[PDB]
Amino acid sequence: AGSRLETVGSIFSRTRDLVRAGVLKEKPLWFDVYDAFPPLREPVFQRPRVRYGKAKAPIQDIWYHEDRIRAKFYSVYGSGQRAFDLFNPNFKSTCQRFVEKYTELQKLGETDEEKLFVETGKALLAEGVILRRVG
Amino acid sequence: EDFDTRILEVRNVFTMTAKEGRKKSIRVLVAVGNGKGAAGFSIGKATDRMDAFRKAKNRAVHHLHYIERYEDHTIFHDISLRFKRTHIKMKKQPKGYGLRCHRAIITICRLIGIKDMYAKVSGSINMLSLTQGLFRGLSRQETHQQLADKKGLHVVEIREECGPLPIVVASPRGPLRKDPEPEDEVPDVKLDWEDVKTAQGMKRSVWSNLKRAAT
Amino acid sequence: NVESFASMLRHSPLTQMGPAKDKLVIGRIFHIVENDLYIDFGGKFHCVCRRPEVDGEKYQKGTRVRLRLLDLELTSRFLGATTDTTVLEANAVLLGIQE
Amino acid sequence: STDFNDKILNEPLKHSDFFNVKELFSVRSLFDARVHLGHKAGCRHRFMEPYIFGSRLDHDIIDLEQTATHLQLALNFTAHMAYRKGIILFISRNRQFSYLIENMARDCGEYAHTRYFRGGMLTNARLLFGPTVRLPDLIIFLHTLNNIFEPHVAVRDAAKMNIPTVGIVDTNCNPCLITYPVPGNDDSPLAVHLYCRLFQTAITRAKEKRQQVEALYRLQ
Amino acid sequence: PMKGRFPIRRTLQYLSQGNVVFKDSVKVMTVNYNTHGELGEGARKFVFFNIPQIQYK
Amino acid sequence: TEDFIKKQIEEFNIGKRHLANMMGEDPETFTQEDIDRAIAYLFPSGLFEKRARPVMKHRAIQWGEDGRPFHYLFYTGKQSYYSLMHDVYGMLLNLEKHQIGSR
Amino acid sequence: SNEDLPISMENPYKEPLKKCILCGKHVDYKNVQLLSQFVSPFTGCIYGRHITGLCGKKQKEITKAIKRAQIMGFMPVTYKDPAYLKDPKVCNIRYR
Ligand code: FES
Ligand SMILES: [Mg+2]
Tell me the C-alpha distance between A130 and D32, whole Å: 30
- For residue G14, the chain C residue with the least C-alpha distance is C19
Question: d(Cα B41, Cα B7) in Å, to the nearest integer?
Answer: 10
CA-proximal residue: ligand 1, atom 4 (nearest): G55
Pairing of strands C47-50, D180-183: unpaired
Distance CA F84, CA F90 (A): 10
This structure's resolution (angstroms)? 3.0
Partner D, chain A 10-39, Cβ-Cβ below 8 Å: 10-12, 14-15, 28-30, 32-34, 36-37, 39
Q: Which residue range(s) make up the domain with G82?
A: 2-96
Asked if E9 and B186 come within 8 Å (Cβ–Cβ), the reply is yes
Query: Which neighbouring-strand residues pair with C67?
Result: C25, C94
Spatial separation of the C-alpha atoms in residues A17 and A2, rounded to whole Å = 10
Residue B83 β-bridge partners:
B86
**Chain A residue with minimal CA distance to C66?**
A83
**Residues counted in chain G:** 96
Q: How far A11 CA sits from the closest chain D CA (Å)?
A: 5
Nearest to C85 by CA among D188, D97, D150: D150
Amino acid (1-letter code) at residue A52? Y
Count of structural domains, chain D = 1
> Distance (Å, rounded) from C-alpha A69 to C-alpha D177?
44
Closest-CA distance, D156 to chain A, in angstroms, reads 7
Mutate to test the pocket of ligand 1, among G18, G20, G21, G52 (most ligand atoms within 8 A of CB): G20
Round to whole Å and give the CA distance between B201 and B187: 22
Task: Measure CB to CB from residue B36 to each of A8, A9, A22 and give the nearest one.
Answer: A22
Task: Report which ligand 1 atom has the smallest distance to the Cα of G20.
Answer: 1
Q: Which of A89, A131, A95 is nearest to C19 (CA)?
A: A95
CA dist D203 and D209 (Å) reads 10
Distances (CA, A) of F76 to B106, D121, D134, F63: 46, 8, 14, 14
Angle among Cα C7, A129, A98 to the nearest 5 degrees reads: 30
Residue-number span of the structural domain to which D131 is assigned: 1-220
* B186 torsion bin: left (phi>0), alpha (psi -120 to 50), beta (else): beta
- Phi–psi pair at B106, nearest 5 degrees: -60, -45
Angle at CA of residue B129, ends B123 and B132, nearest 5°: 130
The experimental method, as deposited, was cryo-EM
Q: Mind telling me how many Å the CA of E1 is from chain B's nearest CA? A: 4
Report the C-alpha gap between B78 and B76 in whole angstroms.
Answer: 7
Q: Which residues of C touch A134 (CB under 8 A)?
A: none
For chain G, the domain total comes to 1
CB D12, CB D83: distance < 8 Å: yes
The Cβ of residue A27 has, within 10 Å, a number of other Cβ atoms equal to 14
Interface test with A, best of C5, C7, C10, C23 (most A CBs within 10 A): C23
Compute how many other C-beta atoms are within 10 angstroms of the C-beta atom of residue F44: 9
For residue B118, the cross-strand partners are B91, B100
> Which chain E residue has the Cα nearest residue B189?
E6
Pocket-forming residues, ligand 1, beta carbon under 6 Å? G 19-20, 23, 55, 57-58
- Among residues B120, B124, B74, B82, the alpha carbon closest in space to that of B100 is found at B120
- What angle separates helix D95-108 from helix D189-219, to the nearest 10 degrees? 10
Q: How many CB atoms lie within 10 A of CB C1?
A: 2
Distance CA D147, CA D115 (A): 11
D and E make contact (3+ CB pairs below 8 Å)? no
Helix, strand, coil in percent for chain C, rounding step 5:
15, 40, 45
Asked whether at least 3 C-beta pairs link C and A within 8 Å, the reply is: yes
